[PDB]
Design a protein around this ligand. Structure first.
Ligand SMILES: Cc1cnc(-c2ccccc2C(C)C)nc1NCc1ccc(-n2ccnn2)cc1
Ligand SMILES: [Zn+2]
Lengths: 77, 285
């Protein structure tokens, strides 16, 4: 329905075709389809906020040409 | 007895970085006073912690699961921000310290029309390797003109077609503290990149700003991760005192005072450090 951008681990930008009703799980599955990163290892940041699983893009007001940022978790203790 | 600080080294590193951010604990004291005569638990525990660390630091000067650190910083800052908005309905602590605004431009290569998006940011996620490098290289990879082609073609509403496009990011409004989130992890499956960038002490983002600025930045805090994998490790934090001019090295329970020269040399990728920098913090000069 609308196209969004995702900056990946190497800074390279990919595109995604999404719905405003799509969930963060769906977006993470599409990002895995393009990048090979399991959705449980993906963190998506939009406008400074981390996108929480179970929410939708409409909950975050993600529009066309919105840019997500894809990072991983570096766990320490 | 402090053989349990290491279990929360992510939270400890983030708290040590926030305690030395300029104006952070002043704002937390202000919000604590507001919430006190309002009668929130995050603000009150933050105040208790800041008072405890003040006690310990005054004693020092006179009488000598595993979690991601950036994610913990994000959670704490979001909670403080929500508390501020609720008390609002002084209350712009996170907005003035850590929040800037980006202008994201897309240029279609067919019709050459420009579309802009304005987004907020609290940190800058830059890559560390390509797929000896400096931080300038990483911020260029983040914000310089990138051409999206092939399978990542842009859909142009003006052409009503898929086109190649040029994207570029520009810094508009600037926070006082710039947080560099280093993507020191790669995917083939997931691994950690142990080679750090050549980190500078001084930073200028005028090369990627919407307007010519003379405001420079200075490195005051670094969060590092030790380990050969991304799923496990240990977080340390090096903060600069602004002892003023020395770097404090926080490793669990023991603190080391350091010259800026020795710290900068330890950061060098030519020395192959075991502590991989993960978060860089730059304050406006
Ligand atoms: C052993 C230790 C480890 N973490 C922290 C700490 C610091 C800030 C925020 C939060 C924490 C902890 C509670 C997570 N504090 C420590 N020790 C106290 C201390 C503080 C400052 C100095 N110092 C020397 C010159 N200027 N300041 C010397 C000693
Ligand atoms: Zn076009």
């Amino acid at each position: 329905s609308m196209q969004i951008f995702v900056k990946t681990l190497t800074g390279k930008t990919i595109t995604l075709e999404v719905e405003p009703s799509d969930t963060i799980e769906n977006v993470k599955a599409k990002i895995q389809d393009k990048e090979g990163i399991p959705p449980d290892q993906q963190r998506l940041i939009f406008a400074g906020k981390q996108l929480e699983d179970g929410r939708t893009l409409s909950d975050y007001n993600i529009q066309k040409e919105s840019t997500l940022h894809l990072v991983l978790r570096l766990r320490g203790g | 007895g402090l053989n349990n600080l290491g279990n929360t080294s992510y939270l400890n590193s983030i708290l040590q970085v926030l305690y030395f951010c300029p104006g952070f604990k002043s704002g937390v004291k202000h919000l604590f006073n507001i919430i006190s005569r309002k009668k929130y638990e995050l603000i009150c525990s933050l105040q208790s912690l800041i008072i405890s660390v003040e006690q310990l630091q005054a004693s020092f000067l006179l009488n000598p699961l595993q979690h991601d650190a950036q994610e913990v910083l994000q959670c704490i800052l979001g909670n403080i921000q929500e508390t501020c908005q609720l008390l609002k309905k002084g209350f712009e602590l996170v907005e003035k310290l850590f929040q800037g605004q980006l202008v994201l431009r897309t240029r279609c290569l067919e019709c050459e029309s420009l579309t802009e998006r304005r987004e907020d940011f609290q940190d800058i996620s830059v890559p560390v390797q390509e797929d000896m490098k400096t931080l300038r290289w990483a911020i260029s990879q983040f914000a310089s003109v990138e051409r999206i082609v092939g399978e990542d073609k842009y859909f142009c509403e003006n052409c009503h077609h898929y086109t190649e496009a040029e994207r570029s990011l520009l810094f508009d409004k600037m926070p006082e503290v710039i947080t560099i989130h280093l993507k020191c992890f790669a995917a083939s499956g997931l691994s950690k990149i142990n080679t750090p960038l050549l980190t500078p002490l001084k930073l200028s983002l005028e090369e990627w700003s919407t307007k010519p600025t003379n405001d420079s930045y200075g490195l005051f805090a670094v969060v590092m991760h030790s380990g050969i994998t991304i799923s496990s490790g240990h977080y340390t934090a090096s903060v600069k005192v602004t002892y003023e001019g020395k770097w404090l090295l926080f490793d669990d329970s023991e603190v080391k005072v350091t010259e800026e020269k020795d710290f900068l040399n330890s950061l060098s990728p030519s020395t192959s450090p075991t502590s991989t920098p993960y978060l860089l913090f730059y304050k406006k000069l």
